[PDB]
């Protein structure tokens, strides 16, 4: 992504201690959605792609 979304996902981690990885993978997420929530879940709302967001286990394949 860019500096757009570097606010986007910027929030959706900040609090991860790790969100290093995060913005990375959100990043790409955020590329693919082209959209992404304001807040640290519960905010899908806004954009719930992230909650569709579902692997093999069903998991979310982004952080």
């Known amino acids: 992504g860019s500096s ?3 606010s986007k996902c910027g ?8 969100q290093e ?3 990375k993978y959100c ?8 959209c992404v929530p304001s ?3 519960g905010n899908k709302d806004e954009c719930p792609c992230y909650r569709d967001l579902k692997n093999s286990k ?3 394949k982004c952080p």
Do not use: M
């Not at 990043?27 to 082209?34: L, N, R």
């Open 4 to 6: 757009f979304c570097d």
């Open 11 to 18: 929030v959706r981690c900040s609090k991860a201690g790790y």
């Open 21 to 23: 990885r995060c913005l």
């Open 27 to 34: 990043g790409i997420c955020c590329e693919k959605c082209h």
């Open 39 to 41: 807040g640290t879940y």
């Open 58 to 60: 069903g998991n979310p």
